[PDB]
Design a protein around this ligand. Structure first.
Ligand SMILES: O=C(O)CCc1nccs1
Ligand SMILES: O=C(O)CCc1nccs1
Ligand SMILES: O=C(O)CCc1nccs1
Ligand SMILES: O=C(O)CCc1nccs1
Ligand SMILES: O=C(O)CCc1nccs1
Lengths: 273, 278, 275, 273, 273
C-alpha cells in the first residue's frame, strides 16, 4: 500500500517518522509534496528516504491513502487542484483542524460522486510512536476504510474512532496538549534551576516525572485524585506545593486552555459545510 | 553489572515501599520472597497488596534488619530517628542503609548510627511513585563510609525501575520539589485537562485517556529530543491557530509561575522536614 | 447505667452534647449537671427545660459527676483547674473540650492536687445536637484502659467518633471543629444563588441543604474518591461542568484549604497554659 | 405498578437503587434500556433484580411510569422512536435538564393527542435516599399523576411540586449541587492533609462535618448565619478561618456556580417549545 | 599579554569569543581550566584554538590577567587552591556575582600581601561584542590596572568604572538583563504567531524591533518617554497596545526583576568581607 502526504510540515514529518519507525511503511513507499522545499521538515524527510515532489498531483498519482497535512485555510485550494485526480482507490485523510468531512466531500463530489473521506486529529508525539489520534469516517467511507485507518494510526500511538462532532474538543485536549506539556516542562525546569539544579538535570527530571505519572494513570483503574493522594504525606512537601498550585487556579487555567483551543478550532473552518 | 541473589528490606510498608517492591519485582531484578517489609499498622492497603505479591511482612523492624542486606528506610522523615534508635544495634557490616525520607541528611543518619558501629554505609535517595510502572525518577548520594561498589549497586537497582543518577547531596531537596512531588502536579493537571475535555463535550473516560496520552507523548518527545522545550512548543502551534490561542490563556493566568512556585514550595518544605541534627 | 455527667460551662457545646446524649437515650437529663457564671444564656434556659441540673458552683458539678466535661473557652481552662483541682477524686474522668489546650498542660495543673488525674482531650462539633457530630479524642497519661472505650461509646452515640494521637487534634479542629461554619456560610451563599436565579428563599435554603446532606451521605457510604463522584454528576458539555469551571476560576479549592489551615494555626495560638 | 427507565446512566441507576432500597418498588417491576450499558450498572441492576433490555420499545411496553433519563439532546430522538408506542396508561417523566414540558408534549402529540407528561429535576443522592427533587405537571397530566410522582420521589429524598419556570434554577442549585459538595470535600480533605491528617481520616471528618451541618439547618428554625455565629467563639479558630473564606469571595463563587449552571441549563433545550 | 580563565562555562566562552573576534587577543594566548571538560562551552573553546587544562594551577602559571569565571560559592575554593601561585605580575579579575573585593583580597593576602584585584560584572552579549561591563578596582590595583581592564572590556561592549557598592544593582539590570530580553522576545514572537505570523519571521521582527529601539535610545539625547511618544499616532495601534501593557503593570514587573536580582546577588556573597 502507498501513502502520500500533501504538505511536508511538522505533522507530515512526524507521521512519516513514526510509520517508518513502527515498520508498517517503508520510507520509499511514502511521497510528500510541498510548495516550499526549504523547510527543515523537508530536509529530514529526504534523509529518511521519503520521496519529495513540488507537485501535489504527483503525490495523488503515487498514493492510495492520501493525508492532507496542510493548514485548514489551505485545504480548499488543495481539493480544487487535485479533485479531478482522485480515483476510486483513494482514501482522503484530512488532518486539518476544524475542517469538516461534509465540506471536503462537497468539494470533491464536484469531480467524482463518492469520495472516501476520513477526518483525523492527531498530534506530534506520533514521531515517538506515542501519539493520541481520533478519527471519524465520512459518508462514503467503506467499513474497511475505518479499520485500515485505525490499524495504521495505532502503530504510532493511541487511536480510536469518534463521532465527528467531538473532534474540535479533542483538538483542544490532545491536539494542542503537547504544547501545554512543553510549557509546563520548561517552567518546572526553571523551578528546579531556581532551587539550585543544573538546567539539563532539571529538564530530565521534570520530563521523567511527567512521563511516569502519565504512564501510571494510563495503567491504573484509580481516579487521578487518588493517585495524587498517594504522593502526599500529611504535612509534607507535596501537599504544600499542591496548595500553591490551587491558590493560583492552576486547574482552571488548564480548563481555559482546552476550551480556548476547541473554540478557536470551530473558527478555523474555511469551507461551507 | 553486579550479581545479586541479595535480600532487600523496607522499614515502612507504605506507598513508596509498595511502589519500589512492585517495580523491582516487575523488573525481574528481585524475587518477592527476598523482600521483607515491616510496619506498625497491618491494616494499610499497601500492606495487603505487598502480601499478595508474596512479600514477607512483619511487625518487627529488627526482623527486617536481620533479613536484609540492602535496608530501605521508607518511613516519614520524623519517624527516621526512632527507627535508627530502635535498630541501630542490629546494623552489621554487610548492611547498606538507604534512606528515602525527604529532607533527612546523610550526616544526621551517620551520627545516629555511629553511636552503635563506627562506619555505617549510608545512601540517601529521592525517588517517586512512578517506579511502580518502572518509569521513576531517582537520584542518590553516597555517604562517608559507602564502599566502592555501594553507589554502583544502588544505581543498578534503581535504574531497573526508571531514570537514576548520582547527585551531590545538597541538590536532593530541590529534586524532591521537582520529581519527588512532580507526579502529584501531573495528576492535578490531568484531572483538570479531563475536566476541560468534559466541558467541551467529551466523555470523561475518553478525556482522561487523551490527556494522559498527550502528556506521556510530549514527555517522551522531550526526553528523546536535542531541542529546547520552547522549540518543541513552537512546532505544535500553527500561526493564528488553536494551540497558540490556548497558550495565551495559560500565560495570562501565570501558568509558568505556578509551577515554579510549586517546585519552590515543596523544596522549602523539605528543608523544614529534617528531624535530626546534622 | 449509673453514670453521672457534668459540664463546666453551659454554652453552645454543653447544650449540644447534653441534647445529643439525651436524645440518644444514653443519659437521662437528671444525671447531667452544668455550671455557668452566667445563667442568662439561652443555652442555660434550654438546658433547664431539658431537665438538666444547673448550678453557679463549679465545685457542685465536680461533686455530682463521674465524667467531667470542661466545655469552657481555652483561656478559661486554667482558672477552672485551679478552682476545682482539689475536688477531683479517683473516680473522675476529666474530658477537656477546649481548642488547643494540651493534655500535658491539664495534667500538670491537676497533678499539683492529686498525682494521677485521668484526662481525655476531645474535639467535637455542634452537629452532635442532631447526633451527627464528628468527634476525635486522645487519652492522657493516666487514663485507664476502659476510659477511652467508655468515651468512644458515649461520643459515638451522637456522631462519628474515633481515637487519634493528640498531635492531630489541632488539625481536626480546623477541619471538623470549625467545618460546620464553613458549611453554614456555603449554604447561605448557595441559597442567595438560588434566589438570584428566581427561587423563593425558603425553597432555596431547603434544596441547598438537602443537596449538601445527600452528597455528604453519598461520600460516607461510597468506596469511591470524591473526584469520581464529582465526575459522575457532570455530563459532557452540561450545566454542572460549566458551574465547576467558575468555582475553579475563583480558586474555590484553595479557599477551603486556607480555611482549614487558618483555623488549625489559630488553635495552636489559643493554648493558655504551659505544656 | 411498573416503572421503566429509558437511559441506564448515573441517574437511572441512582433512582432504581433508591426506589428498591425504599421498598416502594420491587426490582423486577423495573426495566431499563440502553444500547450500551457498559457501566458496571448492568451487574448491579441485575443483582438488584432490574430487568434489562437494549430496545426502548420493550421498556415502553413493560412500563406504566416511564422515566426519560437520557441527555437533553437525546430526548427528541427517544420521543420520535417511542412516540407511537405511548398508550393512555403512560406517564412520561422527563429528567433531562432544560427540556421543557411543552416541547415534549408537542413531539408526542404528533402521535396521540393528550400525553401525560411530568418534568422533574432530581439528583444523584437519591441513591442513598437523600435526594432533592422538584417536579412540574404537564397540560394533560391527571391530578393523581402529580400525587403519584410525589409519593414515589419522596421515598428517595425531599420532593416538592414547583412551577416549571423554576426548574432551571433548581438545576443550578440542587441538580448540580452535589458536585459542588464533592469538590468542597476533596479540598477540605486536602486542607486536613496539609495540616497533618491522614487522607482517609480527613475525608471522613470533612464529610461528617458537612452532613451534620446540613442536618442542623434542615431541623432548625434559625437562619444559617445564626448557626454560623454559634460555632465561633470570639477571637477563636473558626472566625479566623471564616475571614480567609470571605477574603477570597467564597460566597460569590457559590452564587456564580448556581448562576452558571442555571444559565447553561437554559441553553441545553434541544427542541422547539 | 596572556589571559587565563579559571572556569570554562558560558561567561568564559563569551569573553574569549568576543576578545578573539575583537582581535585584541589571539586564541592561543588564552588558557581556560575546568573540572568538567564535557561541557559544550569547553568544546567550543577548543575549536577556537583556546588552550584547555583540567588544572587551575596551569592557568595561573600561563596567565598575566586571570579571570575568575566560576560561580560565587566556588570562588573561595579557587583562591585557596591557587593563592600560593599568585605572583606580582597577576591581575585577578573576579566575575562572580556578589563576591566582594575585600573578601578576595583577604583570602589572597594570606599568601602574598598586595594582590591586584578587580571586580567586574559583565554579561553574555560580549560574545557579539555588545556587552555591558562595569568594574571596580581593589585596594592594591595599580592605576594602570583599571585602565588596562577598561581597554580590554571596551573591545567587547560598553565598559565603565563604578564604585563597588553599585555592582549588585548593575547585576540586577545589565547582568541579568539579557534574560529579561530573551523572555520578552519569546513572548513577542508568540504574540506575532497568535496574530498569524510564521514563528521564524516573528522572532526576527521582534528582535530587530528591540535592537533598533535600543540603538535609538543609545544615540538619542531624548528621554525614552519622548521616543515612545514619537511612535504613537493619536487613537492608533501603538497607544492601544501601550494601554494593555500599563493595565498589567508591565513597568512594575521590570522594576521587580531588577530589584529581585540585585537582592539575590547580595545573598550570594560566600566569604567574609
Ligand atoms: O510529600 C512528601 O513530604 C513526600 C515527598 C517524597 N518522599 C519520598 C519520595 S517523594
Ligand atoms: O494549532 C493549530 O491550529 C493546529 C492544531 C492541530 N492540527 C493538527 C494536529 S494538532
Ligand atoms: O450537568 C448536567 O447538564 C446535568 C444536570 C442534571 N440533570 C439531571 C439531574 S442533574
Ligand atoms: O472557634 C473556636 O475557637 C472554637 C473551636 C471549637 N472548640 C470546640 C469545638 S469546635
Ligand atoms: O500607532 C499607529 O497607529 C502607527 C503605527 C505605525 N505606522 C507606520 C509605522 S508604525
Amino acid at each position: 500500500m502507498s501513502v502520500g502526504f500533501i504538505g511536508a510540515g511538522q505533522l507530515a514529518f512526524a507521521l512519516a517518522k513514526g510509520f517508518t519507525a513502527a515498520g508498517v511503511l517503508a520510507a520509499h513507499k511514502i511521497m510528500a509534496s510541498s510548495p516550499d522545499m526549504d523547510l527543515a521538515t523537508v530536509s529530514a524527510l529526504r534523509k529518511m528516504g521519503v520521496k519529495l515532489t513540488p507537485h501535489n498531483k504527483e503525490t495523488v498519482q503515487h498514493s492510495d491513502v492520501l493525508f492532507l497535512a496542510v493548514k485548514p485555510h489551505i485545504i480548499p485550494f488543495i481539493l480544487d487542484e487535485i479533485g479531478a485526480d482522485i480515483e476510486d482507490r483513494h482514501i482522503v485523510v484530512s488532518c486539518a483542524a476544524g475542517v469538516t468531512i461534509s465540506s471536503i466531500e462537497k468539494k470533491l463530489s464536484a469531480f467524482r460522486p463518492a469520495p472516501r473521506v476520513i477526518r483525523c486529529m492527531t498530534n506530534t508525539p506520533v514521531v515517538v510512536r506515542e501519539g493520541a489520534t481520533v478519527y471519524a469516517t465520512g459518508t462514503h467511507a467503506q467499513v474497511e476504510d475505518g479499520r485500515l485507518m485505525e490499524q495504521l494510526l495505532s502503530s504510532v500511538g493511541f487511536c480510536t474512532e469518534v463521532e465527528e462532532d467531538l473532534i474540535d474538543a479533542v483538538t483542544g485536549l490532545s491536539g494542542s496538549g503537547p504544547a501545554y506539556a512543553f510549557t509546563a516542562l520548561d517552567a518546572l525546569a526553571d523551578g528546579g534551576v531556581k532551587m539550585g539544579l543544573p538546567r539539563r538535570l532539571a529538564v530530565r527530571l521534570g520530563a521523567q516525572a511527567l512521563l511516569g505519572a502519565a504512564k501510571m494513570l494510563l495503567h491504573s483503574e484509580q481516579h487521578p485524585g487518588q493517585l495524587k493522594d498517594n504522593v502526599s504525606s500529611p504535612g509534607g512537601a507535596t501537599i504544600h506545593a499542591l496548595h500553591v498550585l490551587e491558590s493560583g487556579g492552576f486547574r482552571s487555567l488548564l480548563i481555559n486552555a482546552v476550551e480556548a483551543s476547541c473554540i478557536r478550532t470551530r473558527e478555523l473552518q474555511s469551507m461551507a459545510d
